[PDB]
Design a protein around this nucleic acid. Structure first.
Ligand SMILES: [Mg+2]
Ligand SMILES: [Zn+2]
Lengths: 83, 226, 716, 302, 342, 26, 63, 237
RNA sequence: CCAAAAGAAGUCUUUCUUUUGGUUAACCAGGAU
């Protein structure tokens, strides 16, 4: 029973994201920290270079960084280590 | 089994402000749909003219009273909302109503300028007495649908201006019926009888013409796909 | 996952975000210019506003927040008006009807705050109730009626299937559901007429799939002939592609079962989309079902007068017997009450037999949409007995239905019960709030902190006790005591190999296998026996009723348990207490109102029926000391277990002698901690079960665990 | 100044003065009073109600064309749901509805050859009524069901020889939105509904930033000033149950009373930066001072 | 709202019980309330049972005990001798029902009729022991609950709400009396005091939106002034408009001018609307409602609200508080509407 | 019924009321 | 003593705590909420609150 | 009178013969005015051809099974019913499909007369076993819409002929939905979303164009009453 | 962090400089879900 195209805030599907991590609590911090990194990159883009990179996936015409983070977690382009 | 008899429309005049148009022969099941399409167009998208605001010499707002007039400005405004007036020119125009001494004030006392005309001179507006003196100027404008009162600040207007809700709808009541002929030989068709009644501003023929002109454009939109 | 927000409210909550974008898009020079534009509501702000709110969650909340699902995150979308538009499927969660309620809207700001509102609190991620695991986003009311009308089979309807008559071929066979829809649009077919269709995109049932295709399955595209109504095909086109074909009438129970199955076997997104499609179909077909109320549809029983006269004769005879002194006042009242209860039941039966099956009222009642048949009997047939201000029945009784109209006296004697109910409701809401507040505070240090304490202790579960002649009758209350547990030992039967291994979720398949193998008791892990120093482990607690999998390693189980216990207050109708006061005195560990003494040692019991009070003595088999309970006022009865307590009968160590409530303190002192735990959990569950509320036992286990932490020092 | 969320014409100004020896409270030299008037229409969310406890807010306001209309083209004014009537046991409204129609169209009982049995006890002067007649049914002595059924069976046509509502009280409606007639007859009538004083214009409120209290720096309350919606004690348990720690921290620190966090987060939002970390709420320090004022030596260690 | 406010009996106050301290035994409806306090009308919130309304026919005797009128039956003959009884006298005797089969000579059709015994018990007594009968039905209900048609077909829970919600309706610009009422509207409107009643019979001289001049039969002339767009305690409108012409002859006690919620002297709190009872696309789901747009175009349910603002000038020790256009730190664009003196 | 100028509102009432409602503000 | 003082009987709890010179370790959900910290439950525990995100070497090479 | 914002029309091809047209931004209320009319015109105003009746040898009285064929009569009937055929002659023409010996009968085995064509030659119809023979005559005429089975007007004329339902319309299934759109202070306009599925004898775009032409021709009758009447005009494309 | 005044530049209305000014609570009552 395949699903239809997810709409808006429900894309990508949450189950596929949870397959990447152990729990949803881990996914929250995963995505939040990556979003902070993306926003830091954007603010620092015009200024001196820093370690922070990204986005690793082509962004939309206007896309909030948090969404981008999830779209990377789904693509399996990141890695994390819990405490 | 291809029936190649194009539909035709015929009129039957019940009275001056009402009529019935019969369209036949239609395909089986396409009577209610066509009738409802015409009814929706007639009841919503027919242009007309209506009063947009009034100004009374002695009053500053809508919540006051005119000396000598039995009604208050609110009741007078609600009475004027029943006027049926047809205009012929785009720009706003003004008509005047002046009355002195005792007596009833009817819509026939309004002195329209060229082009505009009042179709119900017998409507009641107010009643005066020996101390009464009424002097009100009305603004008539063209449009369609229902437009709420325009704020006095939006335009450049004095404190004496009274905005009024405008209803530019000439049509009053539209209905229809279908007479389906389902024969055992499977040669079927419909027969749409559409009844239209307008408020004496335009004849039902003119309202059905406007409905047809709107729908032809909106469907030729899709016709020119290739 | 969406909520409609008035645009003047959205423009105010999102003011800084809109100002930043206005400055970014060169619609303004400095932040002051953008701030003035927003306050002046220039045309372009809207074009920016809809860009800002995209994929930005907003938390909606309605007070009182009894449970977790009172706060939920939705994606906002601008709407015209000044009212917030709420999806109809979440009203059960918020407990929000539309008679004038209000809700509050909060806006998360930071990245972590936004991530939690998309992954933890989103409305489409929480479909199952955390208290019991049942879905909360089911269709209800109008939707149930629509789906019940759609999926119904009316014999001899338009365009039904007709067998070959010998002169013409079969009629009613359609080559595809598209042809069936085309026929229905022409009036030749009825959406509730039995037909035969050739389906190629709907998976066949289990038996048909096995007996027609074999191999592996239908493999979408393969065609099969289905004999059903068009409405059922329309209904099944809403379910996932791989879901078998359901050929049944969709009573509320059937829809609940289907949604439970989808939740178990499919991801959350599929379930959310399916419930949305069901909502749309139910709302579309409810308008066409023709359910209206008119006084011509409220039929009256044909022979109510005959029944009422027949029982009036009996009432007259009883009154005459009383008038001659043959019986006292109480006997007369009891006789009259029995007569009138019988009359009410007979009138209800006559009314039930009279109504057709297509009447709007019995249709709304029978489809599970709303209401019961008692209200229908009151409306149409007869009201019946009414209560006093004290609570005893008036023997009159009320004899007119609300269709005919009550007289003055009947209305007056009805107002008694009406006002009693209203006052009870008010006091009940207050008490429930207070109880929940205390429960959340006692247990908030119970948090899952590990994955396995690797202990061996556990609790046994009754699990379908054996039948007398020999048979396994399943325990009725097994979904709330054995499901969602992890085994602490292995299940072995008749020397056979281990049926179920240690550490298993113990779901439906495993319970079915255990019942088939022929075992009655199993030992499962529970929080009452956790070995962790602070908080519980994840294996002991077990499956999370909301997520459906093993609980996480940060879950606050204490607050969830407190909210699950206290949320179903309100709907808990109030010398032995038996309502919300009963729960309050159970958790407070107070001595019960009607305390019933319990035996302290086994042996036979000598009972002396003194004057104004009994006297019980327990004969110890050991012979050390005799325990005597003297006062035991005669008002209370004598307990019956298995026959009323008979002199010389043998009693158990924890047997309850009188009829009433045993105090938790004595049972703890006599039988130990496990028995008091069992007693408390069972007593608390009884109150909820009686009213028809499902709470899994692990929440009560958490609370009881927190009640039993300390010990009292006797020798320093 | 005219407070928040108000407008309208100024209709009256009443000014007193000590000069004209008007009686005023001691120490007052002048007193001015201004009246502002508004004209409110009905809108979504406004609360309506009948006389039988059938309340409910206005869900939608459809255009005239897409509303169920009778056979003669008359749209209905209001639509009420069926599922609420039989369950709440206020069937009286339905009866009113029925009688309303008989009062609207008017009726005439045909006593051609003897008055019918059901109208045997119906007071004369009720055997025929003109359209838009006004009738009265005293509270506990009124119209019986048999009389209502009889009156429904005999009722006048509207303009032509058409009776729109049959003997059962139900009429065939047309789907004004798709055009097809509804499959079954519907119950139509006239009901007397009132407009309750619970309008949305007084209920809606929103805030991004505004006034803050003095002793504790949390935002004010109420629509008149501005104020924020309370995030009570019961709403905090739900967030803890969800496990959302950061949402609760931001709600209780940088949205209510972190005196520097508020300005820093506003600047970060307008400048597109990252939201900074919260500090310490001010109410906690107020609490520490209040405890110290009771001669309790509250100290925070490290 | 005002009429019901004046006929209210509150059990809470100085010398009475408290809202958060009263039990369920004082909120109940005693069987001695029949005819003396309405059992339906009462607040829905936590005040339920502590506030009630006096019944229609009830009065208060010198000692403060409420009384009701009963029509006394002599030897089975229902006389017209009305006697006012209090709770104890009613307790001693046997009281029948108003809606009983009187046979045009004050004699019951059948011997067995429902009656009320000493302790409020209801029984069937042969029609020879009855001592009294109710003057009428509608004796146990108050003014608000007497205006609900078909009350005997509604449950008490819904009748209570319907009665409590008739005193929240806002006055509309134009009023319309119900097609189906109960005959209590006229009396309630007249006794509320929101209409102008011709004090003495005469002939109308002048009529205007502001005043009415009545020429009494003997020389004297009386001028009634009207309250035009006056604010009430709760911010609504209090209009009054004449309903008489310049030639009509009025009679003492006749209504001469409508009020806020009256239509020719009868209470009119709402409007008659054409209603269907179908479920429609789920928009009237879970107690919601669907309206036509006509009701907005034609101002059927439009209302007027008035707000009042005050400010005063006070001496103060420093002295000289002033009301003037000269305000510091204020530009001229924000001083355009203000007139020459503020 | 007793007010001089009142609208004619026909009633379904069967019984007769011996006593007229007192002054509601008495 | 902070949680107990905030639950009920503030005066008695405070006075007996003052006499006993009790010290509060700030380990509960309620105390952390009062003092404005991150609750030790759900996302606020060390295991999840100290995650280190990092692009995969392959993604860095590609970009 | 101008409309202000002109609507458009775009297609989203999903399958070889399946489309999803979107029309926006329509005036607030014209989503339903032309959605249902367009759906009805698509489903019941496009001329087409379909099998009207069939006669099969060996089947006169008993309609349960066909000798020498695996599939029962009803299966054959509803296999021939879903046959895509295009014709030009108005008069009902007759075709013969005949095959002997074991094997599979396919629509490509039909020999159509001049004008008649079959657009799905590879459609399974029946299976023959053990030297079986099948010979069935189809009657094909062009019509419009969906016409249920027409019962024998003259039973004596033909005894073996059995009528079958006629699916003349090349469009098989159509649905429509209406949404809301616009960031222009309104947020209340309409968006019509058609979903047209056709046979392989026509494409959805051609069907939509033909439906639009038919509707224009129909409403021309209402227009022609008064040519110089004021209406709403969208302007040049 | 906003408002007012004065000066300079440019745009035909933004920026820079100087000066001045610039938020409550507690009770009682009445409603709502
Ligand atoms: Mg509610
Ligand atoms: Zn453990």
């Amino acid at each position: 029973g395949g699903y239809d195209t997810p709409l808006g805030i429900t894309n990508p599907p949450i189950d596929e994201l949870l397959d990447r991590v152990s729990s949803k609590y881990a996914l929250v911090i995963y995505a939040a920290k990556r979003a902070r990194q993306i926003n830091d990159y954007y603010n620092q883009l015009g200024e001196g270079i820093l370690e922070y990179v990204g986005p690793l996936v082509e962004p939309g015409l206007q896309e909030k960084p948090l969404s981008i983070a999830l779209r990377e977690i789904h693509a399996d382009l990141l890695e994390h280590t819990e405490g | 089994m291809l029936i190649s008899q194009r539909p035709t429309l015929s009129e039957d005049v019940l009275t001056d402000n009402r009529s019935q148009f019969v369209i036949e022969p239609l395909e089986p099941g396409f009577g209610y749909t066509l009738g409802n399409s015409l009814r929706r167009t007639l009841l919503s998208s027919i242009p007309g003219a209506a009063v947009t605001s009034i100004r009374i010499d002695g009053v500053l707002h809508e919540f006051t009273t005119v000396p000598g007039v039995k009604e208050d400005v609110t009741e007078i405004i609600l009475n004027l909302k029943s006027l049926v007036v047809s205009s012929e020119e785009d720009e706003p125009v003004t008509m005047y109503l002046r009355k002195q001494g005792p007596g009833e004030v009817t819509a026939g006392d309004i002195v329209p300028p060229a082009g505009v005309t009042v179709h119900n001179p017998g409507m009641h507006i107010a009643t005066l007495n020996d101390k009464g003196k009424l002097e009100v100027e009305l603004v008539v404008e063209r449009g369609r649908g229902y437009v709420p009162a325009v704020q006095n600040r939006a335009s450049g207007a004095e404190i004496g201006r009274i905005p009024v809700d405008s209803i530019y709808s000439p049509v009053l009541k539209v209905t229809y019926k279908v007479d389906a002929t389902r024969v055992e030989q499977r040669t079927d068709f419909d027969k749409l009888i559409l009844d239209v009644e307008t408020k004496n501003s335009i004849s039902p023929r003119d309202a059905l013409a406007s409905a047809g002109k709107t729908l032809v454009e909106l469907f030729g939109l899709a016709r020119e796909l290739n | 996952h969406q909520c409609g927000l008035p645009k003047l409210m959205a423009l105010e909550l999102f003011k800084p975000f809109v100002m930043k974008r206005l400055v970014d898009l060169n619609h303004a020079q400095n932040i002051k210019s953008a701030k003035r534009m927003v306050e002046r509501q220039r045309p372009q702000v809207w074009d920016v506003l809809e860009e800002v709110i995209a994929e930005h969650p907003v938390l909606l909340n309605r007070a009182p927040t009894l449970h977790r699902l009172g706060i939920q995150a939705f994606e906002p979308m601008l709407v015209e008006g000044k009212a917030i538009q709420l999806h109809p499927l979440v009203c059960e969660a918020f407990n929000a009807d539309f008679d004038g309620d209000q809700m509050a809207v909060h806006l998360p700001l930071s990245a972590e705050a936004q991530a939690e509102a998309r992954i933890l609190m989103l409305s489409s991620n929480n479909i199952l109730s955390p208290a019991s695991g049942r879905p909360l986003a089911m269709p209800r009311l109008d939707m149930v009626t629509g789906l019940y009308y759609l999926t119904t089979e009316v014999p001899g309807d338009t365009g039904e299937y007709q067998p070959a008559s010998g002169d013409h071929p079969e009629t009613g066979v359609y080559s595809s559901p598209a042809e069936a829809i085309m026929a229905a649009d022409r009036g030749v077919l009825s959406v509730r007429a039995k037909i035969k269709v050739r389906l190629t995109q709907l998976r066949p049932p289990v038996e048909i799939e096995a007996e027609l295709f074999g191999h592996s399955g239908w493999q979408p595209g393969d065609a099969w002939m289905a004999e059903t109504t068009l409405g059922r095909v329309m209904f099944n086109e809403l379910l996932p592609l791989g879901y078998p074909f359901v050929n049944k009438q969709m009573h509320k129970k059937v829809q609940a079962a289907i949604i439970n199955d989808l939740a178990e076997r499919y991801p959350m997104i599929v379930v959310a989309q399916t419930v949305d499609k069901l909502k749309d179909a139910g709302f579309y077909w409810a308008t066409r079902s023709g359910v209206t109320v008119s006084m011509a549809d409220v039929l009256v029983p044909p022979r109510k007068k005959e029944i009422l006269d027949h029982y009036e004769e009996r009432a007259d005879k009883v009154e005459k017997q009383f008038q001659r002194g043959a019986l006292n006042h109480d006997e007369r009242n009891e006789a009259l009450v029995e007569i009138w209860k019988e009359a009410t039941d007979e009138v209800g039966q006559a009314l039930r037999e009279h109504y057709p099956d297509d009447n709007p009222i019995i249709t709304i009642v029978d489809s599970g949409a709303t209401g019961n048949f008692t209200q229908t009997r009151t409306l149409a047939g007869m009201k019946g007995l009414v209560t006093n201000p004290k609570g005893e029945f008036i023997p009159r009784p009320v004899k007119s239905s609300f269709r005919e109209g009550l007289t003055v006296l009947e209305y007056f004697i009805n107002t008694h019960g009406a006002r009693k109910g209203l006052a009870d409701t008010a006091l009940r809401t207050a008490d429930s709030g207070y109880l929940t507040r205390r429960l959340v505070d006692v247990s908030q240090d119970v948090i899952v902190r590990e994955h396995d304490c690797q202990t061996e202790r556990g609790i046994v579960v009754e699990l379908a006790e054996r039948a007398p002649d020999g048979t396994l009758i399943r325990d009725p209350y097994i979904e709330t005591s054995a499901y969602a547990r992890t085994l602490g030992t292995d299940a072995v039967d008749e020397a056979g190999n281990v049926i179920v291994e240690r550490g298993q979720d113990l779901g439906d398949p495993e319970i079915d296998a255990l019942l088939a193998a022929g075992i009655t008791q199993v030992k499962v892990r529970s929080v009452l026996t956790c070995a962790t120093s602070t908080g519980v482990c994840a294996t002991c607690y077990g499956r999370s009723m909301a997520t459906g999998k093993l609980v996480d390693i940060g879950e606050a189980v204490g607050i969830v348990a407190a909210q699950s216990i206290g949320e179903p207050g309100t709907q808990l109708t109030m010398d032995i207490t038996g309502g919300l006061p009963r729960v309050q005195e159970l958790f407070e560990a107070r001595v019960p109102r009607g305390k019933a003494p319990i035996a302290d040692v086994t042996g036979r019991v000598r009972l002396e029926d003194g004057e104004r009070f009994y006297k019980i003595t327990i004969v110890p088999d050991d012979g050390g000391e005799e325990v005597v309970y003297d006062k035991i006022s005669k008002r209370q009865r004598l307990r019956v277990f298995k026959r009323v307590l008979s002199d010389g009968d043998h009693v158990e160590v924890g047997q309850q002698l009188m009829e009433g409530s045993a105090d938790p303190h004595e049972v703890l002192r006599v039988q130990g901690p496990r028995e008091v735990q069992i007693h408390l959990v069972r007593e608390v569950q009884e109150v909820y079960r009686a009213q028809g509320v499902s709470i899994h036992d692990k929440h009560i286990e958490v609370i009881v665990r927190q009640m039993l932490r300390r010990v009292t020092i006797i020798d320093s | 100044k005219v407070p928040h969320g108000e407008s309208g014409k100024v209709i009256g100004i009443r000014v007193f003065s000590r000069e004209d020896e008007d009686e005023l409270p001691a120490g007052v030299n002048e007193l001015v009073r201004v009246y502002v008037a508004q004209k409110r229409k009905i809108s979504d969310g406004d609360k309506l109600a009948g006389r039988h406890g059938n309340k409910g807010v206005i869900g939608k306001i459809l255009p005239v064309e897409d509303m169920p209309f009778l056979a003669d083209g008359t749209p209905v004014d209001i639509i009420l749901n069926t599922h609420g009537v039989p369950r709440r046991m206020n069937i009286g409204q339905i009866l009113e509805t029925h009688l309303g129609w008989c009062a609207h169209s008017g009726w005439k009982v045909d006593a051609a050859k003897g008055v019918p049995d059901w109208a045997a006890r119906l007071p004369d002067e009720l055997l025929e009524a003109q359209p838009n007649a006004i009738v009265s049914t005293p509270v506990f002595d009124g119209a019986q069901e048999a009389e209502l059924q009889g009156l429904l069976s005999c009722t006048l046509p509207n303009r032509d020889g058409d009776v729109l509502v049959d003997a059962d009280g139900k009429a065939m409606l047309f789907d004004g939105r798709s055009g097809e007639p509804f499959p079954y007859p519907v119950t139509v009538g006239y009901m007397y509904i009132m407009k309750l004083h619970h309008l949305v214009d007084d209920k809606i409120h929103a805030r991004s930033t505004g006034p803050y209290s003095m002793i504790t720096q949390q935002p004010l309350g109420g629509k008149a000033q501005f104020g924020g919606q309370r995030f009570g004690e019961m709403e905090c348990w739900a967030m803890q149950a969800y496990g959302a720690a950061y949402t609760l921290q931001e709600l209780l620190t940088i949205k209510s009373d972190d005196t520097v966090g508020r300005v820093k987060v506003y600047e970060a939002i307008v400048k597109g930066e990252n939201i900074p970390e919260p500090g310490i709420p001010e109410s906690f320090k107020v609490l520490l001072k209040e405890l110290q004022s009771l001669c309790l030596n509250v100290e925070v260690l490290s | 709202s005002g009429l019901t406010h004046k006929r209210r009996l509150s059990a809470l106050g100085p010398g009475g019980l408290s809202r958060e301290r009263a039990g369920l035994e004082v909120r109940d409806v005693h069987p001695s309330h029949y005819g003396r306090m309405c059992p339906i009308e009462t607040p829905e919130g936590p005040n339920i049972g502590l506030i009630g309304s006096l019944s229609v026919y009830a009065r208060v005797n010198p000692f403060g005990f409420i009384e009701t009128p009963y029509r006394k039956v002599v030897d089975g003959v229902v006389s017209d001798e009305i006697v006012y009884l209090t709770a104890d006298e009613e307790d001693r005797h046997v009281v029948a029902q108003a809606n009983s089969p009187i046979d045009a000579d004050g004699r019951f059709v059948e011997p067995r009729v429902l009656v009320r015994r000493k302790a409020g018990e209801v029984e069937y007594v042969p029609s020879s022991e009855v001592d009294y009968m109710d003057v009428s039905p509608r004796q146990m209900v108050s003014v608000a609950t007497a205006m609900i048609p078909f009350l005997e077909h509604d449950d008490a829970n819904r009748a209570l709400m319907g009665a409590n919600m008739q005193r929240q309706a806002v006055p509309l610009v134009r009023s319309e009396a119900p097609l189906v009422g109960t005959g209590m509207e006229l009396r309630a409107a007249i006794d509320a005091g929101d209409v102008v009643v011709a004090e003495e019979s005469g002939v109308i001289e002048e009529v205007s939106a502001d005043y009415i001049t009545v020429m009494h039969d003997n020389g004297t002339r009386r001028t009634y002034r009207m309250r035009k767009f006056a604010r009430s305690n709760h911010g609504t409108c209090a209009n009054q408009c004449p309903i008489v012409d310049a030639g009509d002859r009025v009679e003492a006690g006749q209504v001469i001018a409508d009020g806020p919620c009256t239509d020719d002297g009868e209470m009119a709190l709402g409007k008659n609307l054409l209603v269907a009872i179908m479920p429609w696309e789920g928009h009237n789901y879970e107690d919601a409602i669907i309206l036509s747009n006509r009701l907005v175009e034609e101002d059927v349910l439009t209302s007027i609200h008035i707000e009042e603002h005050e400010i005063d000038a006070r001496d103060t020790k420093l002295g000289a508080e002033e009301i003037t256009r000269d305000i510091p730190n204020i530009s001229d664009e924000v001083l355009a509407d203000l007139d020459e003196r503020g | 019924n007793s007010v001089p100028g009142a609208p004619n509102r026909v009633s379904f009432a069967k019984l007769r009321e011996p006593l007229e409602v007192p002054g509601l503000l008495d | 003593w902070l949680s107990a003082a905030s639950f009920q009987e503030t005066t008695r709890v405070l006075t007996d705590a003052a006499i006993n010179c009790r010290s509060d370790k700030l380990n509960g959900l309620k105390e952390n909420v009062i003092i404005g910290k991150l609750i030790p439950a759900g996302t606020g525990i060390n295991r999840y609150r100290n995650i280190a995100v990092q692009p995969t070497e392959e993604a860095r090479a590609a970009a």
